[PDB]
Design an enzyme around this catalytic site. Structure first.
Site, PDB file in Angstrom:
ATOM      1  N   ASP A 254       4.314  15.965 -25.231  1.00 19.93           N
ATOM      2  CA  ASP A 254       5.639  16.386 -24.604  1.00 19.93           C
ATOM      3  C   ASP A 254       5.899  15.655 -23.456  1.00 19.93           C
ATOM      4  O   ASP A 254       5.307  15.880 -22.344  1.00 19.93           O
ATOM      5  CB  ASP A 254       5.468  17.832 -24.060  1.00 19.93           C
ATOM      6  CG  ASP A 254       6.759  18.616 -23.486  1.00 19.93           C
ATOM      7  OD1 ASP A 254       7.730  18.130 -23.442  1.00 19.93           O
ATOM      8  OD2 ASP A 254       6.682  19.775 -23.302  1.00 19.93           O
ATOM      9  N   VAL A 255       6.997  14.849 -23.758  1.00 20.27           N
ATOM     10  CA  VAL A 255       7.271  13.764 -22.511  1.00 20.27           C
ATOM     11  C   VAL A 255       7.770  14.351 -21.261  1.00 20.27           C
ATOM     12  O   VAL A 255       7.916  13.862 -20.153  1.00 20.27           O
ATOM     13  CB  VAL A 255       7.809  12.461 -22.770  1.00 20.27           C
ATOM     14  CG1 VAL A 255       7.109  11.785 -23.917  1.00 20.27           C
ATOM     15  CG2 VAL A 255       9.377  13.008 -23.422  1.00 20.27           C
TER      16      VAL A 255
ATOM     17  N   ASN B 115      11.765   6.140 -24.642  1.00 18.79           N
ATOM     18  CA  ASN B 115      12.996   6.362 -25.732  1.00 18.79           C
ATOM     19  C   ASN B 115      13.162   7.849 -25.857  1.00 18.79           C
ATOM     20  O   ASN B 115      12.093   8.607 -26.316  1.00 18.79           O
ATOM     21  CB  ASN B 115      12.552   5.553 -27.282  1.00 18.79           C
ATOM     22  CG  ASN B 115      13.203   6.158 -28.129  1.00 18.79           C
ATOM     23  OD1 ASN B 115      14.647   6.084 -28.104  1.00 18.79           O
ATOM     24  ND2 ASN B 115      12.657   6.561 -29.253  1.00 18.79           N
TER      25      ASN B 115
ATOM     26  N   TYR C 200      24.946  14.527 -22.282  1.00 19.66           N
ATOM     27  CA  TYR C 200      24.427  13.236 -22.676  1.00 19.66           C
ATOM     28  C   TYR C 200      24.881  12.104 -22.051  1.00 19.66           C
ATOM     29  O   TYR C 200      23.931  11.450 -21.406  1.00 19.66           O
ATOM     30  CB  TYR C 200      24.902  13.080 -24.225  1.00 19.66           C
ATOM     31  CG  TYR C 200      24.475  11.946 -24.802  1.00 19.66           C
ATOM     32  CD1 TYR C 200      23.079  11.727 -25.189  1.00 19.66           C
ATOM     33  CD2 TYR C 200      25.338  10.596 -24.896  1.00 19.66           C
ATOM     34  CE1 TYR C 200      22.611  10.543 -25.850  1.00 19.66           C
ATOM     35  CE2 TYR C 200      24.660   9.491 -25.220  1.00 19.66           C
ATOM     36  CZ  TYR C 200      23.534   9.351 -25.820  1.00 19.66           C
ATOM     37  OH  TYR C 200      22.800   8.401 -26.295  1.00 19.66           O
TER      38      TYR C 200
ATOM     39  N   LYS D 100      22.469   9.518 -19.694  1.00 18.64           N
ATOM     40  CA  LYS D 100      22.121   8.089 -20.123  1.00 18.64           C
ATOM     41  C   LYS D 100      22.516   7.439 -19.061  1.00 18.64           C
ATOM     42  O   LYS D 100      22.177   6.299 -18.795  1.00 18.64           O
ATOM     43  CB  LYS D 100      22.951   7.817 -21.447  1.00 18.64           C
ATOM     44  CG  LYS D 100      22.104   8.547 -22.499  1.00 18.64           C
ATOM     45  CD  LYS D 100      20.666   8.173 -22.643  1.00 18.64           C
ATOM     46  CE  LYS D 100      20.058   8.503 -24.025  1.00 18.64           C
ATOM     47  NZ  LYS D 100      18.702   7.594 -24.095  1.00 18.64           N
TER      48      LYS D 100
END
Ligand code: CL
Ligand code: CL
Ligand code: CL
Ligand code: CL
Lengths: 213, 213, 213, 213
Positions: free
Chosen positions: B55-56, B82, B150, B154
């Site tokens: 789980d990053v 990523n 989003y 980003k």
């Protein structure tokens, strides 16, 4: 089998790109002002590079370069539009009108005329289209002191790339730009250009920036 | 011999990058939430990829991923950081606090925690350093409607890349970012990441953008 | 007659903006964590500023702030979404998860929740709409060392502004952002915000950057 | 008491800026190719505007404009460097060399020569320095079809602004740029320019973008 025209091919990044494209199996036309240095690039390639002394600021010389290329190789798939001169590093108001005009003609008019001729050739060939890769700035994230002509004309190349991508699409022409800066070995700019030229026409690196150190 | 950790490796661009790095001769650790899809990526590689369910968004799980990698392979030369989730395409004021937090945790906190662990590992190893490649937006030049979580996260990745490049230099850590947009085949994002990881540490693609069509 | 909500209004640029908007004839609601400093801003205004202690990282506190404002003044025409904390200037991998979360919550979640509440209020009022001005970075053209949480979250604000402009248009909500950097007196950021808020809704400063010296 | 030179002052945004600067109490010199339209701008001002027919692509005409201004008003505090021509909206390869040269001379060479003359005048006067405001693109976030000469030369103006800010600092000369685009009433560009010119020399709006609707 894929054919490239490389401008500024007698020196620096232009020579390294021409040698790397030929190593990757391209047929290459070498464009630059002096035959001597073009010849040394062709010797390095040691295959069938075509030397074409050209003044890219001159519309007729540009047309002659693309005609020579199509005569020899049959088509033009990639143009590396590579120019990069600066005026002297002196107070801006000391620049003469001729010193200004030399940087605009070399860094902006040359690439624009080669892009026009590339549209004429690429839209006419079959299969249609190709790619134009514009060589941008070497001081990407920060202008050097006393550099207004160089900085203005390399920023102009970013605008030219954007309009060339939009206007090229109808002709299956893609356009992208490479910039460098410093927080460099020419081999790294050449391998990046080879990478960009490797992509099929519907994927395109529109901008990339490589930073030294 | 060069070792990569690829997050989101069970699908999409993460899988394509892991397969392409392994094809280029890297040892690869595959990180993602589900073992099943990691296994299929490892089957595609058909060599010695290491599956590491992770789980990053969790600091301990992240530490465990890098420890597993160093235990198996001996060091970590490249991280492909990523992540890419979105909230539902609904009016912004209809988003729940949990839907917001899920996008911030996945797209921004995960990459930041993996970058911290990469600094711990890369600065400690010998030879010292490595490279972190952050996967940016898929709508680079224009946000989609109903995409504030989003688009904000980003854009945050661009800031993280810039600070990671500045702060990594003392540890011989380079950092760069890839973005895509549309005027796409995952193979092209993977070949670009392979290209970026191919460079020596003193040359670095800090930003590149690939555009479809 | 035009009504503003100013966050971070107890200090620095938030106080200067609130004082300048009130001087330009706005009714102003002053939002910030501490009543004491809000009171001093209201004393400086010396009119009818409304002090509203608020935690902008908390959805209920945010809703309460806008409700208090509409109760007092009748509508909300402008929000100055103003946050700006940093983590300590220490090696990135020494930051604790809580130090990271504090910067994300303050600099990114607060502005996002206030933007959601502004959409709820602005879309409901009559005449409909208004403007949101987001306060961006104080190091616009170059990140400071040891600043990844601050740099990532202020870059996230650029993404939030872009999505807020796109998503706000249907509600007659405009959104723009101000950034500063150094090659600064808070009075200049305040006069720029007053300028941005002065425009009618169909013209909008989407981005501006003011540089010291 | 503060003195401005406004180029393109016979029409559009140049006229609106000259009228707005004069309304804010500046002495104004009106530069443009045609006396008739300069006269109408001076009539609108209805004070003591100075009409100076000028070809800003010509170094001698430019020098004459600044000399006329200093003769009349005593110094030059602000230059609004305002040009904006396009070539016809036709396929790029149909543009003649003269159509290309006309856009480069008007949009890039004119502003560069006026910036050089402004450095000569501003560095010589007492108190020393001033500000140059460059008028950028009207399609800021997206180029129009068939616009390579306009798009390249307005991008060049961004580079010129950056170098002018760096090189001007030693002379107490500040430089900033205004751009517009569309998701416009000239009055809004004029009020933004007035705002930018209002700041003291150590604070400077280096870039701002105003978006219609
Ligand atoms: Cl440049
Ligand atoms: Cl984005
Ligand atoms: Cl920042
Ligand atoms: Cl433009």
């Amino acid at each position: 089998k894929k054919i490239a025209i490389v401008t500024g091919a007698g020196s620096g990044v232009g020579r390294a790109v021409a040698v790397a494209l030929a190593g990757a199996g391209y047929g290459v036309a070498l464009a630059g002002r002096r035959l001597d240095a073009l010849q040394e690039t062709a010797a390095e390639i040691g295959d069938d590079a075509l030397c074409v002394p050209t003044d890219v600021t001159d519309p007729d010389s540009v047309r002659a370069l693309f005609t020579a290329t199509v005569e020899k190789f049959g088509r033009v798939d990639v143009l590396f539009n590579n120019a990069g001169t600066g005026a002297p590093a002196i107070p801006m108001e000391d620049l003469t009108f001729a010193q200004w005009k030399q940087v605009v003609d070399t860094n902006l008019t040359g690439p624009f005329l080669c892009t026009q001729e590339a549209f004429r050739v690429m839209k006419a060939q079959e299969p249609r289209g190709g790619r134009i890769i514009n060589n941008g700035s070497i001081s990407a994230t920060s202008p050097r002191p006393y550099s207004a002509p160089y900085t203005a004309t390399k920023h102009a190349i970013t605008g030219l790339t954007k309009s060339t991508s939009l206007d090229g699409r109808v002709h299956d022409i893609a356009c992208g730009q490479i910039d460098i800066g410093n927080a460099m070995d020419v081999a790294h700019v050449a391998s990046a250009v080879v990478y960009m030229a490797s992509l099929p026409l519907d994927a395109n690196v529109q901008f990339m920036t490589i930073m030294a150190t």
